[PDB]
Write a protein that binds this DNA or RNA. Structure first.
Ligand SMILES: COc1cc([C@@H]2c3cc4c(cc3[C@@H](O[C@@H]3O[C@@H]5CO[C@@H](C)O[C@H]5[C@H](O)[C@H]3O)[C@H]3COC(=O)[C@H]23)OCO4)cc(OC)c1O
Ligand SMILES: COc1cc([C@@H]2c3cc4c(cc3[C@@H](O[C@@H]3O[C@@H]5CO[C@@H](C)O[C@H]5[C@H](O)[C@H]3O)[C@H]3COC(=O)[C@H]23)OCO4)cc(OC)c1O
Ligand SMILES: [Mg+2]
Ligand SMILES: [Mg+2]
Ligand SMILES: [Mg+2]
Ligand SMILES: [Mg+2]
Ligand SMILES: [Mg+2]
Ligand SMILES: [Mg+2]
Lengths: 724, 724
DNA sequence: AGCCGAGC
DNA sequence: TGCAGCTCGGCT
DNA sequence: AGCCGAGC
DNA sequence: TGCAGCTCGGCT
């Protein structure tokens, strides 16, 4: 009736107005899918309107924000809803243009969140409408299987997994994952609406417990409630896993009604947990799942030259089975690369291009399609390649992907800090000096006491003092030049240059009466320098009061919510950063033991293989073995009867979960019969034998010291080049 | 005063209004660079406003379009310009808010076109203003070099190339290309405006010859002029190339004034030529530079699975040195993939997703980030891999890229047609049947006369008759069902279904008096079916008049401007499609000769290498050669004394522009001393020898017939699967 | 007076 | 090409 | 009462 | 994430 992107129903606003249905979809792509499915007949009774992502939570939202929201204003106009109107009587429902609203989103956790926000909107503004079976949802499959011309659909991952357990020949079926509504074709869309019984679920009001559930999820007043709520979920799911029990799921059979209580505690709770899993980092590598996928990809690619952020994002997506919008990966990549004051002490990705500055706090970054990046030379030193063999890599989309966590040589979570916002919890950890952390590691390794650590930011000329535990004061730098002039040499951490000029200095220049007379900017892209001119009286006043206080060069930093995932996926709340450092130390020391154990096995096999290859060559030259014009099968019998071992590297690798293999012996070129290459082979076997023996007489701590030494050397070199 | 994206000057609209300067920039990214450059103390006198791409040509534009143009209305409001006002007197110039307009665009050909469009705007509306030195331009470098701490800038590619000629050690310097204003940093931006003298060029009126130059470039009445204008440029530049002479350029030294005549004939002409080069396809492969880069990339990648169009575009850009917006590449990729009626007879890229239909003529395509594509199975058959070794690959950005043209087995330009719009010329070539083209090729190869070819479109049920040469009539299909009902089974080529419904049937239903009573749609995604209800009198009337005429199911097709680039980069205008077919035949036949010659060399070398390797093994087994524990130098002497040839493949590779190399002999594994592998080696030697002998007894025409045969077979298989 | 396509 | 909405929790 | 970041 | 302006020449 005057709104774009709207495919309004034809029978909307007549006698049969209550017999119409409005389909709210997850985006415009979803709108197209719904439209194709609903045709050709049914345009009269069914309407479609796309929602541009997640909508507004209006339960504690201000009056200004709610009225100035375009999304909900469109919905109100289309449906014909009226603000603060009671719909208890069956006559008030006749006023609306549509009878029922069917929410059709993705079959992912985010889709569930969208449904919840819509429900929250209706429940808060019109509680009467919710008790009249006004809301429903259109569900679409997420996994499909077919062997011949028969087809089966699943509507949840637990359902699909349970099917593979019951069905023996599950590998004889095609497997098609549905990332979203966009995956489904127009033809498949028609088949969906043809079987409306299966894909239609009606929301049912059962009592006050529903209101309690809805309020639980979307009230800012009930945060502690959601904490216990999710704590129970995490613990129970953990126990189900320990007892070897499958997760419960919905939409297994055809269901008519769905309680709001059940919806919140069986579907929406899945989102809130996944939100915490993707927003709150792990203590081990300080990475989130999204970030870790990027790092895993860059490690797998091993690019020697720069790569577009946009291009890299796509690579990460396909190689790490990333099932979200690529824009998020791009923003993550940019964030990981930033290295201005207040961001990262040790950026894992190189910011090659305009990734933002301290001027606008990174917001001045260029388009991801116009900037380049690659691994920092410190990345594979912080996360040594040798440790990859002791990690547990996840499986998704029929391929191996990122591990549950990487195991860096120093607690990375303390280096670039940690910021994240989920449901129930949120994480906030300040940055710390790398060299200082390395030192504390060495002290803990020497059985000494770890020194207390103050938050330290790279290239920050200011100071950071501690008052109460986990409560700090960050101060910039100011200096007196004369009776009328002062110099501001540093702003406090995360206090950006442009914002400071607009929010602090410009008010001081104008109007409360003016304080400063004039100011000049001498900023570089990495440093801050303000020169301020004042009267002699004004400066004398500010001097006794406190220059830092007057010019707002002090910011407070309270970090009590240091919430992280431990090495087993449990949400721990760490009290001090030394707790994090200690727990990390235990785990890291253990995995150095594990690395040595693995390396012993590998180097052992490799030495054994070299032993066989050397013996084979020498016996051939001595004439103890004839292979010229000899058949393969006969020659194999010869080797076995002469006691030659099967491929040790192959045999050892297979032990990490066709007859004997002697290919590695004959795969050797004719070169290794020459004198120069024979000596080289005998040299390599002795050298490799030596490496194994050298490793045996080294403690895990010794190996750790090696990595730390190698890291520090390059760290100095890198930061030196930075200063230059 | 009410316009967004505007950083208006502070002294605008005062006494010093004529002392102000307005900077019109190429986009918003350019605005940021200007803003950064004028800082930190330079402001008040300088204003910045971004132009959203190329603006409107107002020389022959309608009154409605000019007044309803947002771009020019903003400039007029900001500067304070008045329509049809004389500015000869020095008092009228005080009325404006700005004194001078400085145009700051990229240093590319497109930027030049923008400057030209601005000049055209001013010259046409206010000729008096042009004679007062009102317009100027801000120029930025395109290439920078630096060896130590000294830096040099170039403002044109010919200047940089001339510099590399004059400077011996040009490789000891860093080379930084500037794709656009976005490439320059904030620091470099500041350095540009700091040296205002160098980067400021004032436009100067010299006489009536300037008006003639401006009119030449932007008047629709002077098209034939631009043909000769560009004809002279192409011929002169061609001769300069043949004589080894450098191109002329501007901005070598610091210049104060620049005449409009020189600007048109030395800068804008570069654009118009580049426009023709990127819009008009080559006769050889029927591809444009943009399209060819996509195909070259897809050939290099050899993807076995689908790829996002967005993702692929980025891949093409970096791998083929593409220096334009990736969106152009995305639209190009989509265009190459389309396969509905009226588009491509043989799409080189598979349209996996919504690439558009005949319903809305391809405009209904989905987002490039949500659709996939890959090479058609016919692609590497049309463009045989064996021909890649005879092509001339271009060099750009220090890497190899697409060739000047590919050499397909059949004239691809005639298959999917050819559409392009440049300056002076424009291309329009209809589609032709593949099999008919294959046949005429075979006829020309058999020494017969080529048969005349009518335009043929794939899956087109209609008819195409020829009236005058290069003038055709395309007719749809209509049938009489009864006295009141007719069936429209096909619309003429490129007459879209939705457009036909709105522009033909709907007027017939309403209001001139109504003709039809009712109509129904029975369309699929690939076919058209209209059923129309009329009175017996109306149908009888339309029947005698002509149903095709009445329902406008006939469209005319005149193709006189069949303009293409020949095999040497000269713009030729072909009269008939048989001329294109004939010229192609000569070139293709020549290159089949070239292919055989190259293959003879390669296969010869490969056979020689296999001969030596086979002989070496047999002599070793027979005991004619001892290599066990023998020194390298001694063993080399043995081989040379036994007449063993040096590495033939290596020798042959090097011929395509210390001492004998026998590595290939000893590089062979010990396996090849065994019976099974010895027989394997001897078979390959015989097989390669056979392949060489087989090639020898084949004419170039014989090889061509082979490719055509292999192509036709797969063509049948593909098109069969399509119909199913 | 609008379509066709590679560009800003 | 640049442009815009919202979530979720803790803190100034 | 607005920032921080991975998501729609 | 989807959205919008214009060029250039030949033809209906
Ligand atoms: C009507 O088009 C649709 C829009 C959306 C939203 C959206 C919605 C907006 C809005 C902006 C956005 C936008 O996020 C902006 O995008 C930027 C993308 O690049 C990075 C660098 O930075 C991001 C911004 O932080 C974010 O502000 C979208 C990107 O991916 C989405 O999911 C976003 O401003 C006004 O309302 C979803 C849909 O269907 C699910 C749609 O059909
Ligand atoms: C935002 O501000 C700027 C805009 C531009 C233009 C542009 C200008 C427009 C306009 C749209 C566009 C747009 O093209 C649209 O994009 C689409 C994107 O890809 C495919 C899918 O299809 C393309 C459309 O055919 C085209 O309609 C731009 C894409 O790349 C450009 O060069 C385009 O509508 C109104 O005016 C240049 C600048 O600096 C040089 C700017 O700062
Ligand atoms: Mg989704
Ligand atoms: Mg950070
Ligand atoms: Mg450009
Ligand atoms: Mg075409
Ligand atoms: Mg909030
Ligand atoms: Mg025109």
């Amino acid at each position: 009736k005057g709104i774009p992107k709207l495919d309004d129903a034809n029978d909307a606003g007549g006698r049969n107005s209550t017999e119409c249905t409005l389909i709210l979809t997850e985006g415009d792509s979803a709108k197209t899918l719904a439209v194709s499915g609903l045709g050709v007949v049914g345009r009269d009774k069914y309407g479609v309107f796309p929602l541009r992502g997640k909508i507004l939570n209006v339960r504690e939202a201000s009056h200004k924000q709610i009225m100035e929201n375009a999304e909900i204003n469109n919905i109100i106009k289309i449906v014909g809803l009226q603000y603060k109107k009671n719909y208890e009587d069956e006559d008030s429902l006749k006023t609306l243009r549509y009878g029922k609203i069917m929410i059709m989103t993705d079959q992912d956790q985010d889709g569930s969140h969208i449904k919840g926000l819509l429900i929250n909107f209706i429940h808060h503004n019109w509680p009467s409408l919710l008790r009249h079976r006004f809301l429903e949802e259109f569900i679409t499959p997420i996994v499909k299987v077919s062997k011949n011309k028969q087809e089966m659909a699943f509507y949840s991952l637990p359902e699909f997994e349970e099917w593979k357990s019951s069905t023996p020949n599950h590998k004889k079926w095609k497997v098609k994952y549905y990332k979203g509504l966009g995956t489904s074709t127009s033809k498949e869309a028609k088949e969906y609406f043809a079987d409306m019984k299966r894909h239609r679920i009606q929301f049912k009001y059962s009592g006050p417990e529903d209101d309690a559930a809805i309020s639980l999820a979307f009230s800012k007043k009930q945060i502690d409630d959601r904490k216990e709520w999710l704590t129970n979920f995490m613990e129970d799911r953990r126990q189900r896993k320990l007892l070897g029990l499958p997760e419960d799921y919905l939409y297994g059979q055809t269901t008519t009604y769905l309680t709001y209580n059940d919806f919140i505690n069986k579907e929406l709770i899945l989102f809130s947990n996944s939100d915490n899993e993707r927003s709150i980092p792990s203590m081990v590598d300080g990475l989130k799942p999204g970030q870790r996928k990027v790092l895993f990809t860059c490690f797998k690619r091993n690019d020697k030259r720069e790569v577009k952020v946009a291009q890299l994002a796509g690579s990460v997506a396909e190689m790490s089975s990333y099932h979200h919008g690529e824009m998020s990966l791009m923003m993550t990549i940019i964030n990981l690369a930033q290295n201005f004051v207040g961001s990262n002490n040790l950026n894992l990705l190189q910011p090659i291009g305009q990734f933002g500055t301290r001027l606008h706090g990174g917001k001045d970054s260029a388009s991801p399609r116009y900037i380049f990046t690659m691994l920092s030379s410190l990345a594979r030193l912080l996360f040594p390649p040798k440790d990859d063999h002791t990690l547990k890599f996840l499986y998704d989309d029929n391929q191996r992907v990122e591990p549950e966590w990487y195991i860096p040589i120093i607690p990375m979570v303390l280096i670039n800090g940690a910021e994240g916002i989920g449901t129930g919890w949120s994480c906030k950890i300040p940055n710390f000096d790398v060299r200082e952390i390395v030192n504390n590691i060495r002290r803990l390794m020497d059985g000494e006491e770890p020194l207390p650590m103050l938050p330290s930011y790279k290239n920050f000329k200011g100071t950071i003092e501690e008052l109460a535990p986990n409560q700090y004061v960050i101060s910039g730098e100011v200096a007196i030049l004369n009776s009328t002039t002062i110099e501001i040499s540093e702003l406090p951490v995360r206090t950006w240059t442009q914002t400071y000029k607009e929010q602090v200095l410009e008010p001081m220049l104008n109007g409360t009466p003016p304080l400063i007379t004039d100011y000049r900017e001498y900023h570089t892209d990495t440093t801050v320098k303000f020169v301020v001119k004042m009267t002699e009286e004004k400066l004398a006043e500010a001097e006794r009061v406190g220059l830092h206080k007057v010019f707002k060069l002090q910011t407070s930093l309270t970090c009590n919510s240091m919430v992280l995932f431990d090495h087993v996926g449990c949400l721990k709340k760490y009290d001090t950063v030394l707790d994090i450092l200690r727990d990390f130390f235990e785990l890291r020391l253990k995995y150095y033991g594990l690395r040595k154990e693995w390396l012993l096995g590998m180097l052992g096999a490799e030495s054994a293989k070299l032993n066989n290859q050397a013996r084979f060559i020498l016996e051939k030259i001595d004439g103890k073995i004839i292979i010229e014009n000899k058949p393969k099968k006969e020659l194999i019998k010869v080797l076995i009867q002469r006691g030659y071992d099967s491929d040790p590297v192959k045999a050892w690798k297979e032990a990490q979960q066709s007859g004997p293999t002697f290919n590695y012996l004959l795969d050797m070129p004719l070169w290794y019969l020459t004198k120069e290459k024979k000596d080289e082979l005998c040299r390599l076997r002795n050298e490799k034998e030596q490496e194994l023996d050298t490793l045996k007489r080294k403690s895990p701590s010794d190996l750790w010291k090696e990595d730390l030494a190698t890291f520090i050397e390059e760290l100095e070199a890198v930061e030196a080049k930075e200063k230059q």
